[PDB]
């Protein structure tokens, strides 16, 4: 992301590659997580569903 301020950042997912089509009806839980490093064992910081 960009530098984090009190003002929320712009839409991080506004790019065209962040799209999905669901093959079954119902409730689908879309989650978003924040890490610090780009490697696998990086510490989770926050999550939102």
């Amino acid at each position: 992301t960009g530098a984090l301020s009190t003002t929320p950042t712009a839409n991080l997912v506004s790019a065209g590659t962040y799209t999905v089509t669901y093959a079954s009806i119902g409730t689908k839980f879309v989650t978003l997580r924040l890490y610090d490093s780009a490697v696998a064992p990086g510490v989770l910081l926050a999550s939102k569903t």
Binding site: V30, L32, L34, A46, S47, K48
Partner: peptide, 6 residues
Amino acid sequence: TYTLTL
């Protein structure tokens, strides 16, 4: 802390 909207 981090405040997220989605």
